Amino acid sequence: SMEQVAMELRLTELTRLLRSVLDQLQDKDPARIFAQPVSLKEVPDYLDHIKHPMDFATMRKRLEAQGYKNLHEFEEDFDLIIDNCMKYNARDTVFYRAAVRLRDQGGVVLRQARREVDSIG
């Protein structure tokens, strides 16, 4: 149908906007602490601690399959990256501190993204 196509152009454009959001958030992680999944070879107990692991590469795979239906879904995954880290790692660690800084800096980007998603529809 023509409606299915219109719907698909919307999803494509949301994907476009989320790709730019993802790039901006990932720039706030210059140390690349959150770039890839936590290695189960190197942290064998990780899944005993963290039930839903997340990282920027895994988000990017979902993004490119148009797997985010709305900004809320994408923010959920971003928040997992931060929240998982702040639980697994102690306060006095470079990892925990990196997550705090990503959260604080990401806030600004996400605030305008919400406005853009509502505005452009």
Side-chain angles (χ1 to χ4, degrees), residues 1-2 4-6 8 11-15 17-40 42-60 62-68 70-110 112-119 121:
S1 77
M2 205 29 252
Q4 291 298 323
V5 173
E8 293 164 348
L11 180 60
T12 290
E13 284 304 293
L14 170 73
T15 308
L17 185 160
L18 299 178
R19 188 181 302 112
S20 166
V21 176
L22 184 61
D23 291 338
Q24 283 175 78
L25 296 174
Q26 191 155 24
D27 292 330
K28 309 312 179 155
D29 175 29
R32 299 192 70 84
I33 293 167
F34 307 104
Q36 295 292 332
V38 167
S39 174
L40 305 180
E42 303 168 358
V43 190
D45 74 350
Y46 188 61
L47 301 180
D48 292 346
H49 290 270
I50 298 298
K51 299 301 175 181
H52 297 103
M54 194 44 55
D55 66 271
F56 284 130
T58 304
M59 292 187 61
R60 198 174 292 282
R62 185 162 164 199
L63 182 58
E64 290 309 337
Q66 303 187 341
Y68 295 114
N70 56 54
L71 190 53
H72 180 75
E73 291 191 341
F74 176 100
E75 290 171 314
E76 286 195 329
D77 271 356
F78 181 67
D79 286 336
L80 277 176
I81 290 175
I82 296 313
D83 291 338
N84 288 348
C85 185
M86 291 173 74
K87 287 167 194 70
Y88 189 84
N89 303 109
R91 212 158 30 254
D92 72 330
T93 61
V94 65
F95 305 108
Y96 183 111
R97 289 159 175 287
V100 164
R101 291 165 61 80
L102 178 58
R103 194 198 55 187
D104 287 352
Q105 298 197 275
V108 179
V109 174
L110 290 170
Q112 204 52 42
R114 167 50 65 206
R115 294 192 69 81
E116 282 172 339
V117 165
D118 292 3
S119 187

